Amino acid sequence: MKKVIATKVLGTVKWFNVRNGYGFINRNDTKEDVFVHQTAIKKNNPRKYLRSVGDGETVEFDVVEGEKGAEAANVTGPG
Fold it and tell me: In angstroms, rounded to a whole number, what is the distance separating the alpha carbons of residues 36 and 24?
């Protein structure tokens, strides 16, 4: 397609680096690189609690035209 892929997209978040505040998503259809930053995440995320999901959590995001490929906007979380 021309520019961005979509809004409201599901996929698997991996390797979130908290210290800088960046991670990446494995965008499902043809395994595409979606970079995601802390400022795109909605609401507030506190700094507590253990058990939510684990590794490979599912999150909603827009897959939106980045630099080389894609980034992520309107990003949610499991709860």
Answer: 5
Token pair of 17 as six digits = 């680096």
Determined by NMR
DSSP the chain: --S--EEEEEEEEEEEETTTTEEEEEEGGGTEEEEEEGGGB-S---S--S-S--SS-EEEEEEEE-SSSEEEESB----
Residue carrying structure tokens 């802390």: 38
Tokens of 28: 């499902």
Please name the fold of domain 1-79: OB fold (Dihydrolipoamide Acetyltransferase, E2P) (2.40.50)
31: exposed, middle or buried (Cβ count in 10 Å: 0-12, 13-18, 19+): exposed
